[PDB]
Amino acid sequence: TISAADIEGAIEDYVSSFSREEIGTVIDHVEGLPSVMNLDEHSVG
Amino acid sequence: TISAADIEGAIEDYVSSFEREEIGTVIDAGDGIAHVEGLPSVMTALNLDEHSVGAIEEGQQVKR
Amino acid sequence: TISAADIEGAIEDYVSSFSADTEREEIGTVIDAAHVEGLPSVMTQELLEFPGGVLGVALNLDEHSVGAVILGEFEKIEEGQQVKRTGEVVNPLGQPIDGQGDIA
Amino acid sequence: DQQLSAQGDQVRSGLESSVDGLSAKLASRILGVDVNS
Amino acid sequence: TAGRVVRITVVDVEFPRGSVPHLGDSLVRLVRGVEV
Amino acid sequence: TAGRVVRITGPVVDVEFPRGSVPELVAQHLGDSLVRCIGLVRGVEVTD
Amino acid sequence: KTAGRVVRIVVDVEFPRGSVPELNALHAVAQHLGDSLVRCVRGVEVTDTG
Amino acid sequence: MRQQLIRQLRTGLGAEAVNKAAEIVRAHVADPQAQSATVDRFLSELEQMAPSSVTSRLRAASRQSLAALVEKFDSVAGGLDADGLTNLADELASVAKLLLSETALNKHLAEPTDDSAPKVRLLERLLSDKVSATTLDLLRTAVSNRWSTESNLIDAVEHTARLALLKRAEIAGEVDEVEEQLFRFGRVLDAEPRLSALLSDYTTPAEGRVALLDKALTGRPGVNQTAAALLSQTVGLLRGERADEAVIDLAELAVSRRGEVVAHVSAAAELSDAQRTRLTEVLSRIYGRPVSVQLHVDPELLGGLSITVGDEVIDGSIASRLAAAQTGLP
């Protein structure tokens, strides 16, 4: 019952469903700016 | 499960709920320093924060 | 003169004696490197076997994992490997390193 | 050692003949039921 | 619009969002809870 | 009413007891019913 | 796929489960930190030579 | 120097002989009769094997509180109807997501306190009428007790929700169907780490991930409805656990409710019905309590079985025997 291709349809459909300038916010350290050039998954030093 | 801003009032009510004496509970105690949960009204008990009060056996009742 | 009789016998006896009976065993998994989750009954200082014949000793025990010091070839240890417990607490292990042969 | 090396090269060829029996016995053992091959 | 003391170590005060006068979550670095 | 070893860090041994049975000073009370006392196996019963 | 991505920047790289490089050279491995991370712009693809 | 040469002869002869033995084994076990015979011999060994005398993450407070809450659910859920159970699960999941979203409310509802009356009053004032009476009772019981951390609270609630669904599955009588479906979903999620990662990211909105799960592999024609609902509910409330691990936990809990233990049996090929029954009987005898057996198929085993229950493994895989022979050389 599992095709392994309909999974691809759904996953890339969702990824497309996600798709603006990225703006970071100061937490105390800046959150956001995922594409910024002390970096870690939480914030930016 | 629609939740309006009543929460904000409700918590305040809860915040006010806790004439009876204020009893704390020792949460840990070592090296001569204890930590007491509770006693929301305790005055400055050296270190105070949202969790505990940094002033013996765990679970003992602490008078304000 | 190296008679082939002993040459072949040294392996014939081993083959005729090989019996790797399946033994109900308690295992764990390397979570980082090495720390091993599982092995609930591992003794402190117990000897642990990691794949590739690597040997470790369980020093730090706690609710999450077991810290194990690897006794050589640590580069072979990978996250997710299976760690067996030996149930028991010349290089320091007694294995000869000169190469002159075996030891009783 | 040249005599020893020659002895080794001779005996390895000599014992290559019996490898079939040893491997067959080992497979017999690690299969539980003996394999004729 | 009035803050309140949360830790008394130095005193940390929590303020309503947008009213922060900065440890994050609106906190900024005596009885706990007294309005500031 | 008897504890059980939870951590063995060399001589140090963190032992967990039921709620109302925590022994008195066992070199330290870590809280949450654990105490830090000074071939052991995690889980072995510890008697006060 | 089976290519990791930079997480923290010493650079931490997160790989798909079952594709963690051995304690290896990577192009944008010092430790296995668990949860398929290893320690050696966030999110840039990282490949392992093997 | 002579014995040095002898040792080189030993290693060379052993390596070549074990390679020949490995080739012989692989050739001989390709026949399905050989596979079945190997499995039968290993099962025989298993009967000959002696019996074994012998939510861990929860600490003392969390574990005891969860025990109390599950007992309360057992009490309340006695005679509730299937539709009532679907409801109750829905309200419990909604309240769990509420607690997760409202960090302040969870925080205030988390701290232990000698008096539980203020917490009960808070819950009643919050959602006295927004959810049925049984949900009120269960939530009141959950908040009355203590939790080591605030997180455990929501965990407990989530647990109840799962239980409720499982209960209606039991009421449906298709517990086996839901357990099998849950295990299959866990397998496919583990095989496709990308799908789990895209589902295992709470940062994205839960509605989108639930829709993705429904459309990808959960809205399929041949999927048990209870299993689909349980998996969707689990992913919706997900906190950061790996989705595949969450599904495995769901299946393990489902088997636990029946009082059994999951045994992950890995085999070279599928097993016969008689072999399956024999394996279940022997594993139950060894471990005492009844065990449900989940079959993985992996050709690399070459034969035999590799059972594992709890943190214990019985590795009868032929490939393991070959590896032992390789390492057992002088």
Residue numbers in the entry:
A (entry chain C): 5 to 23, 28 to 36, 43 to 51, 68 to 75
B (entry chain B): 5 to 22, 27 to 52, 66 to 76, 85 to 93
C (entry chain A): 5 to 37, 42 to 97, 111 to 125
D (entry chain b): 130 to 166
E (entry chain F): 8 to 16, 19 to 30, 56 to 63, 73 to 79
F (entry chain E): 8 to 32, 53 to 65, 72 to 81
G (entry chain D): 7 to 15, 19 to 32, 34 to 38, 53 to 64, 74 to 83
H (entry chain d): 109 to 162, 169 to 444
Task: Quote the authors verbatim.
The mycobacterial rotor consists of a membrane-bound ring of nine c-subunits, attached to an elongated central stalk, made of single copies of the γ- and ε-subunits. The mycobacterial PS is made of two proteins, bδ and b′.
In the structure of the M. smegmatis ATP synthase, the PS is a complex of a single b′-subunit (similar to b′-subunits in bacteria and chloroplasts) and the unique bδ-subunit. In the current structure, the bδ-subunit consists of 16 α-helices with a β-strand separating bδH14 and bδH15, with three additional β-strands between bδH15 and bδH16. These structural elements form three separate domains. The N-terminal “b” domain is similar to those of other bacterial b-subunits. Then, bδH4 to bδH8 form a separate domain, named the “linking domain,” which is attached to bδH9 in the third domain, named “the δ-domain,” consisting of bδH9 to bδH16. However, a feature not remarked on previously is that the bδH4 to bδH8 linking domain can be superimposed onto the δ-domain by a clockwise rotation of ca.120°. Therefore, the δ- and linking domains appear to have arisen by a process that involves a gene duplication event at some point during evolution.
